[PDB]
């Protein structure tokens, strides 16, 4: 629901257009890239499959084996977090996960 009071700033949404540009230049399928294109990119990140794997399991918002716009954004984000010299805690805070996964309680 746009316009109200509940606004959540998705951290990865501020530097998302970069991953968007990469997203489309990886050859997407129907606007969603598969584990093939994604993994190709992720191995060109030169990171181990273990780190990449936990990235996937956290970044796969749909839990659909694919990386959508927001999923791939999260993936690339965690990759560069490692590049910045950090670790992935295997936790997904409410403002790290797209607000599209929230129920109405």
């Amino acid at each position: 629901g746009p316009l109200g009071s509940d606004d959540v700033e998705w951290v990865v949404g501020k530097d998302k257009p970069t991953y968007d540009e990469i997203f489309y230049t990886l050859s997407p399928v129907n606007g969603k890239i598969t584990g093939a294109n994604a993994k190709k990119e992720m191995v060109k990140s030169k990171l181990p499959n273990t780190v990449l794997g936990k990235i996937w399991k956290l970044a796969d918002v749909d839990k659909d084996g694919l990386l959508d716009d927001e999923e791939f954004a999260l993936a690339n984000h965690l990759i560069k977090v490692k590049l910045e010299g950090h670790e992935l805690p295997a936790d997904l805070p409410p403002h790290l996960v797209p607000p599209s996964k929230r129920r109405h309680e």
């Binding site: 584990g35 093939a36 994604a38 993994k39 499959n49 273990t50 990449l52 794997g53 996937w56 399991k57 796969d60 084996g65």
Partner: peptide, 12 residues
């Protein structure tokens, strides 16, 4: 349940 792996990483 029986795992949750369908990712291109944990397949090897």
């Amino acid at each position: 349940f029986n795992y949750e792996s369908t990712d291109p990483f944990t397949a090897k």
